[PDB]
Amino acid sequence: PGYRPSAWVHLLHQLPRADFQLRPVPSVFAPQEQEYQQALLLVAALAGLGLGLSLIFIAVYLIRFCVTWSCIVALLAGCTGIGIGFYGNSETSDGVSQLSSALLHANHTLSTIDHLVLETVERLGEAVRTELTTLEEVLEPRTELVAAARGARRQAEAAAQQLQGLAFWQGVPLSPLQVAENVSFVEEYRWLAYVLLLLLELLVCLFTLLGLAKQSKWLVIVMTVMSLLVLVLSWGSMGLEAATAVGLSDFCSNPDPYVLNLTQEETGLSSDILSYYLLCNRAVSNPFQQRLTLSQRALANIHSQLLGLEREAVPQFPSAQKPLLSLEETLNVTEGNFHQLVALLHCRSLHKDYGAALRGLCEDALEGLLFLLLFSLLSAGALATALCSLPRAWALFPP
Amino acid sequence: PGYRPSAWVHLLHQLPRADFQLRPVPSVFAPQEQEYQQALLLVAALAGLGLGLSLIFIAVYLIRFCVTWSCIVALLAGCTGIGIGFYGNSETSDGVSQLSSALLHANHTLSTIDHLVLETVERLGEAVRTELTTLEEVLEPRTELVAAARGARRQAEAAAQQLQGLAFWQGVPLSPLQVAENVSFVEEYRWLAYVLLLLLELLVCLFTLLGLAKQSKWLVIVMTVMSLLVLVLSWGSMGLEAATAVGLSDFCSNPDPYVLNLTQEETGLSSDILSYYLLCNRAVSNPFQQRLTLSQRALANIHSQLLGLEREAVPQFPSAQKPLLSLEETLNVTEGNFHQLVALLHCRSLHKDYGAALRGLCEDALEGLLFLLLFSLLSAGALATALCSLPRAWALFPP
Ligand SMILES: *[C@@H]1O[C@H](CO)[C@@H](O[C@@H]2O[C@H](CO)[C@@H](O)[C@H](O)[C@H]2NC(C)=O)[C@H](O)[C@H]1NC(C)=O
Ligand SMILES: *[C@@H]1O[C@H](CO)[C@@H](O[C@@H]2O[C@H](CO)[C@@H](O)[C@H](O)[C@H]2NC(C)=O)[C@H](O)[C@H]1NC(C)=O
Ligand SMILES: *[C@@H]1O[C@H](CO)[C@@H](O)[C@H](O)[C@H]1NC(C)=O
Ligand SMILES: *[C@@H]1O[C@H](CO)[C@@H](O)[C@H](O)[C@H]1NC(C)=O
Ligand SMILES: *[C@@H]1O[C@H](CO)[C@@H](O)[C@H](O)[C@H]1NC(C)=O
Ligand SMILES: *[C@@H]1O[C@H](CO)[C@@H](O)[C@H](O)[C@H]1NC(C)=O
């Protein structure tokens, strides 16, 4: 099936970006780059200019002055906005949780791969030791039996070498667990902060409602400054989350060799492996293919040689029965482990995890960021109406 | 990792259920046991009883009668409730969409296995034809070359016979695509119905606000019966969704044996296969292992004597040199296809799809159903307050 970028991804991608140092920008995801970071900060600067324009407009309205139902409508609009904000916060938290689970499963898969390789090599080594025991048991050097034993030992050594070569995550500094725990850590703090902001806005709205119901002049003016502060906070939150959404949408564009380049810089793995596990198409062939065949061939060869020692050596050399059964059991166990490894070296083992990671990072996270945008716009409008209405009614109380 | 039942599913599982015929129900998911169906209908009956009690209480309130700010507070409470309803509808739609996507992916996987097995056996048949070509071009029957050719042909036939049985979804009547299509179909119909109900309640709330703001008595009495009807329909929706949530929670608690039995009754494949792909733990073992353990031998075995024809027949039989490359290419393609098949027969992919299906069906669907429960409760409370307040101030409207 694959991953299809959403409509919002292309809608935000086509947006023109500029810088005061140099307006032309490639509009291509590139962290640790001056132009991209400066443009993303300029987006928040534009949001701050919107803050300033709203403040000037409300000040002008108040100076020019210098209906309650409008205030109730504004606070109901704010309640709808904070519901949208709760939805968006839950959505983005779910998306980043999906991302963290994706890297957790990726680490589990890589661990399982290199692990199974490790004990497969260990079992092959124990098979080599028991084969040495069999040769020690072979006192009379028969023309064919010792040759079969030597061939089986060489085949076991070759299979051990190929299995040692199969492991690819061994010896890389990067591990997904360390880059998933930190992202979960940051996401937890971000969710906590936005939940606190949402609760503060709910308290502000409830204070407005209580002051209107109680007809308490004091309450109104006391929390008007808090309303102004939460308006400024919502404006700045819009700027920050809009920059985050723009960056995320630019990252989620259809071409993604950026992830491949970043991983090749960080882990240092060859591009053929990374291309295979990040594309999983018929154009890219398995980098582990040939080796995976060779080892299995050796294994098959071993079994054949084993049957020889099973069909001729056992009646002549009865003491070799138990070690031969030991080799047979090791062969069965290592063939099961080899099948598990081959199942774990396919694209779907990790390409599906990467697809789910991108799903959580775009189809969930970007939608959550847009819902935070809608939160910020609705909250700014509702609080502007509040600072336009409540002062017009503060002194206008019957007592 | 595995599937971990949540707290809500365990909380709803322990609830006691009763039936008018036979009170002690086993409280075990069984869509074929009648007592289960009457037990689930009893929840909707209890919700209807709550409807009746609320109607009696509001009628008593109006009869005993026979502040607007309370009405505004109730309307903002209803706005919060319908926001919760939006969230719950989106959550349950997302969960059922995840289930449908998992079922579609299960189809795509199984189709990949059986189509790939068909392609592999056809390629082995073409290899048999080319081996017959080698046999006919072998005019002089050398004591070793003809024996090697016969052994290669027999090994190819044995490998084809062993591989012909791998496809376990070739003969089953059930198709996951039809199940996914029908569950989707039902899902968008239910989503459309609930979206229409939510918009109807939003219109009711907006009409309430307009009636209070414009002091239009005529409108309020006209839409009072509308509010009563939406109250009744919300109570009925609460009953239906509560029954659905109870059933889903009772299912999600230890669903593996029930799903295994249902799939045994429908597909009728085998005990070992379904248990393997629904458990994927260490205790369950590969049922295809020996099968695969044979095939990967034969193909590899073939390669051995292929080198014989490469090492002795090539200088003697340049005509045989021509199709030997074709045979080797077929061997390479079938080895790649066999590795793909082995990667496709591990429980990891299908059990991962099943785990995602259960995740969407429980950890998302249960949350959606409980958010619908909250929607229903808050909507019932807000509408009860609305029918307790609006008749008071209908005639008390200033004009
Ligand atoms: C997540 O990553 C850590 C760090 O890599 C895993 O710890 C092991 O680290 C060793 C290094 O010698 C590697 O063999 C493997 O990467 C890891 N596996 C084991 C147990 O040997 C840690 O176990 C990983 N956690 C998960 C989810 O598997
Ligand atoms: C989904 O299942 C259907 C039905 O099994 C697949 O459609 C075809 O089904 C017939 C027999 O049922 C077989 O020829 C193949 O299993 C399918 N052939 C083709 C060309 O599709 C369908 O392929 C499955 N997968 C998808 C993605 O639809
Ligand atoms: C990959 O990244 C490095 C530095 O991170 C950069 O120099 C290089 O140009 C990138 N690759 C491509 C193809 O742009
Ligand atoms: C090899 O292991 C498999 C495990 O799937 C088992 O079924 C089979 O009997 C074993 N072979 C022997 C000879 O014990
Ligand atoms: C499986 O289902 C059938 C009918 O659907 C039922 O008769 C049988 O008892 C079930 N299995 C178990 C173990 O209960
Ligand atoms: C067999 O297929 C592999 C996979 O691409 C390839 O690398 C190898 O060269 C092929 N063998 C021959 C003899 O061409």
Side-chain angles (χ1 to χ4, degrees):
Chain A
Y3 160 64
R4 284 171 217 98
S6 70
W8 299 91
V9 172
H10 281 122
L11 283 178
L12 277 296
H13 196 34
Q14 68 152 33
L15 187 143
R17 296 90 194 269
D19 193 355
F20 63 92
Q21 307 282 19
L22 190 87
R23 320 163 307 270
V25 296
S27 195
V28 177
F29 201 68
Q32 279 82 62
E33 214 290 328
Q34 311 93 349
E35 291 299 355
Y36 190 106
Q37 290 178 332
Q38 189 64 254
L40 268 297
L41 295 160
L42 205 65
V43 179
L46 193 144
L49 270 295
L51 190 171
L53 195 143
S54 55
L55 179 66
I56 301 299
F57 263 70
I58 66 170
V60 158
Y61 181 102
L62 261 67
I63 289 302
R64 186 57 254 177
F65 185 73
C66 286
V67 177
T68 61
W69 279 289
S70 295
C71 182
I72 294 90
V73 168
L75 277 296
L76 188 153
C79 171
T80 301
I82 62 170
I84 290 280
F86 272 130
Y87 183 32
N89 211 15
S90 89
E91 185 57 47
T92 176
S93 283
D94 182 88
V96 187
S97 296
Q98 292 196 50
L99 181 159
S100 60
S101 294
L103 294 102
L104 286 171
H105 186 321
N107 181 20
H108 173 77
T109 297
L110 296 152
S111 300
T112 309
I113 297 169
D114 59 59
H115 173 296
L116 294 174
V117 176
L118 270 182
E119 69 274 15
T120 295
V121 176
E122 301 296 70
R123 304 274 285 111
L124 265 295
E126 310 321 314
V128 176
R129 284 186 191 266
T130 300
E131 182 65 26
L132 185 138
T133 304
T134 61
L135 282 71
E136 190 277 331
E137 181 282 346
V138 176
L139 269 76
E140 200 271 321
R142 219 183 201 89
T143 73
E144 271 146 30
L145 293 181
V146 73
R150 177 47 44 188
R153 192 173 177 97
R154 194 151 321 101
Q155 285 312 310
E157 293 179 353
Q161 173 193 340
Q162 308 298 306
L163 268 290
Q164 283 221 60
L166 294 174
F168 69 99
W169 200 238
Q170 181 145 339
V172 295
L174 182 58
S175 67
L177 183 63
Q178 322 274 347
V179 298
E181 68 175 89
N182 72 38
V183 73
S184 183
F185 182 76
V186 174
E187 176 52 42
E188 182 65 26
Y189 289 170
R190 164 214 185 285
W191 181 65
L192 206 49
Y194 291 167
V195 163
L196 296 154
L197 165 59
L198 294 174
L199 294 184
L200 181 72
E201 185 156 356
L202 182 63
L203 286 176
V204 164
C205 299
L206 275 160
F207 282 172
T208 289
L209 259 53
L210 262 70
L212 286 202
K214 183 65 178 175
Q215 298 285 312
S216 256
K217 258 136 146 133
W218 317 277
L219 189 46
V220 176
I221 30 132
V222 160
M223 51 76 88
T224 306
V225 298
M226 200 173 44
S227 311
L228 183 63
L229 292 151
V230 66
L231 182 63
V232 175
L233 185 42
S234 178
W235 271 128
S237 169
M238 183 180 72
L240 291 185
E241 69 210 5
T244 300
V246 175
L248 183 63
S249 67
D250 189 358
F251 164 74
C252 291
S253 296
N254 176 70
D256 279 340
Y258 156 79
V259 174
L260 172 147
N261 197 32
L262 188 153
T263 310
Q264 188 274 330
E265 292 316 273
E266 183 66 89
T267 61
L269 284 151
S270 164
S271 183
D272 61 338
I273 288 175
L274 294 155
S275 58
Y276 182 76
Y277 293 81
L278 276 296
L279 300 172
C280 165
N281 290 318
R282 306 319 97 72
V284 298
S285 288
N286 189 359
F288 301 111
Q289 169 76 247
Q290 190 69 33
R291 192 178 298 115
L292 269 179
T293 76
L294 277 152
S295 53
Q296 87 185 38
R297 272 196 193 73
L299 284 179
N301 279 357
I302 278 161
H303 183 73
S304 184
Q305 293 273 30
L306 192 163
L307 271 296
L309 303 192
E310 172 36 33
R311 73 188 200 94
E312 307 304 308
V314 167
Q316 189 39 61
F317 280 28
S319 175
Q321 169 82 297
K322 177 179 151 159
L324 188 153
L325 297 202
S326 304
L327 278 72
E328 182 295 335
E329 269 299 311
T330 61
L331 190 150
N332 200 345
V333 170
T334 193
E335 269 178 347
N337 294 132
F338 172 88
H339 280 181
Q340 217 163 320
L341 180 61
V342 169
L344 275 155
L345 287 189
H346 201 249
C347 64
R348 304 181 220 251
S349 183
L350 303 93
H351 180 255
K352 183 151 70 213
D353 291 331
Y354 181 76
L358 297 203
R359 194 82 51 111
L361 195 47
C362 314
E363 182 65 26
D364 289 326
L366 191 49
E367 299 295 327
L369 267 297
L370 308 172
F371 276 118
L372 276 296
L373 297 196
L374 181 41
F375 180 75
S376 50
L377 170 64
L378 294 174
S379 179
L383 294 174
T385 316
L387 282 71
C388 285
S389 176
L390 282 72
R392 290 226 281 126
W394 168 65
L396 278 203
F397 271 177
Chain B
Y3 163 46
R4 193 154 310 111
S6 70
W8 288 100
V9 65
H10 268 308
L11 183 63
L12 277 296
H13 195 208
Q14 65 182 357
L15 187 150
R17 290 80 183 269
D19 193 4
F20 47 98
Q21 313 303 20
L22 185 78
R23 185 132 42 98
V25 301
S27 196
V28 178
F29 201 71
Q32 314 201 238
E33 189 70 87
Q34 309 90 301
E35 289 84 2
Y36 182 76
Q37 281 98 25
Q38 302 75 50
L40 271 295
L41 297 154
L42 195 64
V43 176
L46 190 149
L49 258 56
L51 200 174
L53 184 134
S54 57
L55 182 74
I56 300 299
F57 264 70
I58 63 170
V60 160
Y61 190 98
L62 282 71
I63 286 305
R64 188 57 256 176
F65 179 72
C66 291
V67 176
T68 185
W69 275 290
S70 59
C71 182
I72 293 90
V73 167
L75 267 297
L76 282 71
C79 174
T80 295
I82 62 170
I84 287 283
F86 291 166
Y87 186 31
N89 214 14
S90 66
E91 185 59 39
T92 187
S93 291
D94 189 358
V96 182
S97 312
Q98 290 188 44
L99 159 67
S100 64
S101 293
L103 293 174
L104 276 166
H105 187 273
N107 188 0
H108 164 245
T109 313
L110 299 151
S111 179
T112 298
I113 296 89
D114 63 358
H115 277 256
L116 193 172
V117 176
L118 274 180
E119 301 156 60
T120 317
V121 295
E122 301 268 33
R123 297 271 305 184
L124 269 296
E126 311 325 300
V128 176
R129 265 156 152 86
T130 300
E131 182 65 26
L132 189 149
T133 300
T134 64
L135 294 174
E136 61 86 20
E137 61 85 20
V138 174
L139 318 162
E140 314 171 75
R142 186 179 293 274
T143 72
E144 293 179 353
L145 291 186
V146 71
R150 188 80 247 164
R153 165 84 90 89
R154 191 173 323 287
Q155 279 309 310
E157 311 186 350
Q161 162 195 336
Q162 297 291 318
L163 288 170
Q164 200 144 291
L166 275 299
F168 62 99
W169 208 257
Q170 202 204 309
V172 61
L174 176 70
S175 179
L177 187 153
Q178 271 80 343
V179 176
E181 153 195 4
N182 80 24
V183 71
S184 187
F185 182 76
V186 176
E187 175 50 43
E188 70 267 13
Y189 277 173
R190 166 212 179 286
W191 181 65
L192 212 46
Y194 276 148
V195 159
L196 292 157
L197 161 62
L198 294 174
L199 297 185
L200 191 61
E201 185 153 355
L202 182 63
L203 277 176
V204 160
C205 299
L206 276 160
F207 285 170
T208 300
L209 261 53
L210 261 56
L212 277 296
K214 215 200 312 192
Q215 326 263 42
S216 45
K217 323 190 175 239
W218 292 352
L219 188 152
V220 176
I221 49 168
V222 166
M223 51 85 87
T224 300
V225 288
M226 185 176 177
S227 54
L228 183 63
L229 295 150
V230 65
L231 187 153
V232 172
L233 190 153
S234 170
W235 270 126
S237 160
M238 183 177 176
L240 293 185
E241 68 201 5
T244 300
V246 175
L248 213 49
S249 50
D250 186 74
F251 155 76
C252 286
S253 293
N254 189 359
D256 291 331
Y258 159 75
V259 164
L260 188 153
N261 196 33
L262 188 153
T263 310
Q264 283 293 40
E265 291 317 275
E266 186 85 69
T267 61
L269 295 174
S270 178
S271 64
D272 52 358
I273 295 170
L274 294 174
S275 61
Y276 184 16
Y277 293 81
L278 293 175
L279 293 170
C280 200
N281 78 34
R282 290 180 182 170
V284 298
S285 173
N286 263 315
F288 313 94
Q289 207 273 331
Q290 261 299 319
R291 196 59 64 63
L292 295 167
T293 295
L294 291 153
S295 45
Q296 65 182 357
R297 281 201 191 96
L299 294 158
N301 220 313
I302 278 164
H303 180 82
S304 186
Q305 69 275 16
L306 184 159
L307 266 295
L309 306 189
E310 181 46 41
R311 69 187 297 276
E312 307 305 293
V314 161
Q316 193 37 43
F317 280 4
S319 184
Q321 207 280 337
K322 175 68 174 64
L324 212 64
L325 282 72
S326 302
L327 294 174
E328 185 280 344
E329 269 296 312
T330 61
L331 190 146
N332 205 344
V333 172
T334 61
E335 279 188 356
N337 285 127
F338 172 88
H339 280 180
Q340 214 166 320
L341 176 59
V342 169
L344 275 158
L345 291 186
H346 203 241
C347 64
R348 184 171 321 261
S349 45
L350 280 79
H351 182 273
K352 183 141 80 203
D353 304 342
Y354 181 76
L358 297 202
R359 168 170 269 93
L361 200 50
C362 308
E363 300 171 20
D364 285 340
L366 269 296
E367 271 66 1
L369 267 298
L370 318 169
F371 278 122
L372 273 295
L373 305 201
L374 276 296
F375 167 72
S376 55
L377 169 66
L378 282 71
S379 179
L383 294 174
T385 318
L387 282 71
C388 283
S389 183
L390 294 174
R392 300 247 312 261
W394 158 62
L396 276 190
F397 266 159

